[PDB]
Write an enzyme that holds these catalytic residues in place. Structure first.
Site, PDB file in Angstrom:
ATOM      1  N   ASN A  61      40.333  40.819  35.970  1.00  0.00           N
ATOM      2  CA  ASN A  61      41.019  40.819  37.267  1.00  0.00           C
ATOM      3  C   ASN A  61      40.187  40.131  38.337  1.00  0.00           C
ATOM      4  O   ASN A  61      38.979  40.343  38.413  1.00  0.00           O
ATOM      5  CB  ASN A  61      41.342  42.255  37.691  1.00  0.00           C
ATOM      6  CG  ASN A  61      42.236  42.319  38.895  1.00  0.00           C
ATOM      7  OD1 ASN A  61      43.461  42.180  38.783  1.00  0.00           O
ATOM      8  ND2 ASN A  61      41.643  42.563  40.055  1.00  0.00           N
TER       9      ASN A  61
ATOM     10  N   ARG B  58      35.389  41.451  34.736  1.00  0.00           N
ATOM     11  CA  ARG B  58      35.563  41.232  33.306  1.00  0.00           C
ATOM     12  C   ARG B  58      34.999  42.435  32.555  1.00  0.00           C
ATOM     13  O   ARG B  58      33.826  42.778  32.720  1.00  0.00           O
ATOM     14  CB  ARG B  58      34.782  39.971  32.915  1.00  0.00           C
ATOM     15  CG  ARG B  58      35.114  39.373  31.569  1.00  0.00           C
ATOM     16  CD  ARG B  58      34.746  37.902  31.571  1.00  0.00           C
ATOM     17  NE  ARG B  58      35.555  37.143  32.531  1.00  0.00           N
ATOM     18  CZ  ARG B  58      36.613  36.406  32.201  1.00  0.00           C
ATOM     19  NH1 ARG B  58      36.991  36.311  30.927  1.00  0.00           N
ATOM     20  NH2 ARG B  58      37.287  35.753  33.144  1.00  0.00           N
TER      21      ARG B  58
ATOM     22  N   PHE C  89      48.580  36.381  40.035  1.00  0.00           N
ATOM     23  CA  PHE C  89      47.385  35.557  39.985  1.00  0.00           C
ATOM     24  C   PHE C  89      47.330  34.848  38.639  1.00  0.00           C
ATOM     25  O   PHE C  89      47.222  35.503  37.596  1.00  0.00           O
ATOM     26  CB  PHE C  89      46.138  36.425  40.166  1.00  0.00           C
ATOM     27  CG  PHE C  89      44.912  35.632  40.433  1.00  0.00           C
ATOM     28  CD1 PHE C  89      44.140  35.137  39.378  1.00  0.00           C
ATOM     29  CD2 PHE C  89      44.540  35.348  41.739  1.00  0.00           C
ATOM     30  CE1 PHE C  89      43.005  34.377  39.629  1.00  0.00           C
ATOM     31  CE2 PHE C  89      43.399  34.593  41.998  1.00  0.00           C
ATOM     32  CZ  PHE C  89      42.635  34.113  40.939  1.00  0.00           C
ATOM     33  N   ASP C  90      47.413  33.516  38.641  1.00  0.00           N
ATOM     34  CA  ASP C  90      47.514  32.789  37.372  1.00  0.00           C
ATOM     35  C   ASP C  90      46.159  32.359  36.835  1.00  0.00           C
ATOM     36  O   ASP C  90      45.906  32.458  35.640  1.00  0.00           O
ATOM     37  CB  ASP C  90      48.442  31.578  37.510  1.00  0.00           C
ATOM     38  CG  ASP C  90      49.231  31.286  36.225  1.00  0.00           C
ATOM     39  OD1 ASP C  90      49.747  32.232  35.588  1.00  0.00           O
ATOM     40  OD2 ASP C  90      49.353  30.098  35.882  1.00  0.00           O
TER      41      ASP C  90
ATOM     42  N   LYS D 269      51.855  44.781  45.282  1.00  0.00           N
ATOM     43  CA  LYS D 269      51.071  44.886  44.050  1.00  0.00           C
ATOM     44  C   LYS D 269      50.010  43.792  44.009  1.00  0.00           C
ATOM     45  O   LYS D 269      48.840  44.070  43.711  1.00  0.00           O
ATOM     46  CB  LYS D 269      51.968  44.818  42.808  1.00  0.00           C
ATOM     47  CG  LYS D 269      51.230  45.034  41.485  1.00  0.00           C
ATOM     48  CD  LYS D 269      52.194  44.960  40.311  1.00  0.00           C
ATOM     49  CE  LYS D 269      51.450  44.770  38.994  1.00  0.00           C
ATOM     50  NZ  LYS D 269      52.387  44.622  37.834  1.00  0.00           N
TER      51      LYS D 269
END
Ligand SMILES: O=C(O)C1CCN([C@H]2[C@H](O)[C@H](n3ccc(=O)[nH]c3=O)O[C@@H]2CO)CC1
Ligand SMILES: O=C(O)C1CCN([C@H]2[C@H](O)[C@H](n3ccc(=O)[nH]c3=O)O[C@@H]2CO)CC1
Length: 124
Positions: A44, A85, A120-121, A7
């Site tokens: 993302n 975005r 992904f932080d 993922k």
């Protein structure tokens, strides 16, 4: 059945280009990676580095995760990334994105054996 590692790769890896993001990059990538299926994923990031390089981040600078966990890691080096975005006009199912290329350090959460990126932080 999709693993968390798989993922992550689907959501966040794009080793195919050096930058090289057209103004259209996010529109096409968000759709094809299935991030516009159930809703428009609002933000993302895609990372334009080798899988080995991004996986290596799991052994790099240990930092606090946004959720308070301890299993996050910041890349020692800046990495080529594209921030996607959602635009103000974007409306599901016609998701529309602003594409921003940058070079930034990434912060990922890692889990499992093998210890691999699963979330992904942040980019900093
Ligand atoms: O892919 C990306 O660039 C983004 C994906 C979405 N985000 C969210 C994510 O929920 C992250 N976050 C925040 C709080 C938290 O407990 N956990 C998170 O991952 O911070 C961003 C919004 O605060 C970071 C990066
Ligand atoms: O099935 C499993 O073993 C795992 C499946 C994926 N995960 C989550 C876990 O929350 C991890 N995660 C997420 C956010 C975060 O801040 N830290 C994480 O470790 O990333 C995976 C996908 O979100 C843990 C369990």
């Amino acid at each position: 059945k999709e693993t968390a590692a798989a993922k992550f790769e689907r959501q966040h890896m794009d080793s195919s280009t050096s930058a090289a993001s057209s103004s259209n990059y996010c529109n096409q990538m968000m759709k094809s990676r299935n991030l516009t299926k159930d809703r428009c994923k609002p933000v993302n990031t895609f990372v334009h580095e080798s899988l080995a390089d991004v996986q290596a981040v799991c052994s790099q600078k240990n930092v606090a995760c946004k959720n308070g966990q301890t299993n996050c890691y910041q890349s020692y080096s800046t990495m080529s990334i594209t921030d996607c975005r959602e635009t103000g006009s974007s409306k599901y199912p016609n998701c529309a994105y602003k594409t921003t290329q940058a070079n930034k350090h990434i912060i990922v959460a890692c889990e499992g054996n093998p210890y691999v990126p699963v979330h992904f932080d942040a980019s900093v």
